[PDB]
Design a binder for this molecule. Sequence first.
Ligand code: FMN
Ligand code: CL
Length: 357
Amino acid sequence: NINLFSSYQLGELELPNRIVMAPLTRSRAGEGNVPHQLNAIYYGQRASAGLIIAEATQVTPQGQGYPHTPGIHSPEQVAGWKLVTDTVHQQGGRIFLQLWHVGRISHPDLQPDGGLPVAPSAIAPKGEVLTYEGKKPYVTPRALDTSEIPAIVEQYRQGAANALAAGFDGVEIHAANGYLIDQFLRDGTNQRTDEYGGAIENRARLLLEVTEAITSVWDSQRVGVRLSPLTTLNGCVDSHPLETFGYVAQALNRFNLSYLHIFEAIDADIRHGGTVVPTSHLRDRFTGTLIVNGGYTREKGDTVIANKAADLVAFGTLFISNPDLPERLEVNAPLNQAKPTTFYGGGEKGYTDYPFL
Ligand SMILES: Cc1cc2nc3c(=O)[nH]c(=O)nc-3n(C[C@H](O)[C@H](O)[C@H](O)COP(=O)(O)O)c2cc1C
Ligand SMILES: [Cl-]
């Protein structure tokens, strides 16, 4: 009898429960995009999670797309992240860093020397993007040269090496939500005509090469990957999600990863008139630990574990508002209500001041 409170063996890590804190961008980094003591308090308050996945963290300056997100490319950033991992470890928790590059979802104002965002193909996102001077129209990203792809892979390798020096327990590759890797994955954002575009094995190549590089730094059982097969976020869609994502699920087995993490889009059924990509399709193809996410509750999480449909269940929104989410779920306590106005930016309010039971 397994449920949301069963322990789990994730490589050498002993998880006390199956509850994961999903990665959550909070945009509360200081000068130089460096984490600080407030961030350490925030993660320390949530250390009862089976596993924390820290917010998306850019691996290189050009990988930033929103003001005040932390990076993992500089020594000052490693030192600030050390404050966080030290606090989490003091509180008996475990934490992985989510490794980010936004690709086209950025603006020159956020880029070194005011340069263009990079991407697989020169396709401007629609609408406006937040800068330090409010919202401005997106521009068109520069399509990377074939010869530049190794430099991208190397930025991820260095980001993963920095995470290791910062004292994380592992890393998660952000291959979801329409950011750089996802932009290569999906045919809606990738119309390249080299070995990184066209056929599925080409579109998956960047993910696979990034994963290979990162497993040269970390033991593979401390490296996860996140996918979001049916998001439409950031204008990133694939025309054959079942085949695309079913292929990636199988291709990742080579690496003996920590886990595959699926964000199941909350609006996919209502948009698509049904389910184009049941998570079972991926559960059956990826042979290791599966984390599922999107709108879970105590009862929904228990069910998926009991049914063997997933091993771990990640909660995003509820972990914003309930630092002791595991205990509250365990005893069927009232949950605090999440306050969207304070999700992004600011300080303690709506960040470290949600109460414990
Ligand atoms: C404020 C906020 C920030 C998020 N930031 C990230 C992020 O940094 N990386 C990521 O992969 N997903 C991110 N997401 C998506 C969440 O991790 C999660 O997949 C989503 O909220 C659905 O799960 P939930 O219903 O438990 O909240 C974010 C969502 C929210 C609400
Ligand atoms: Cl995200």
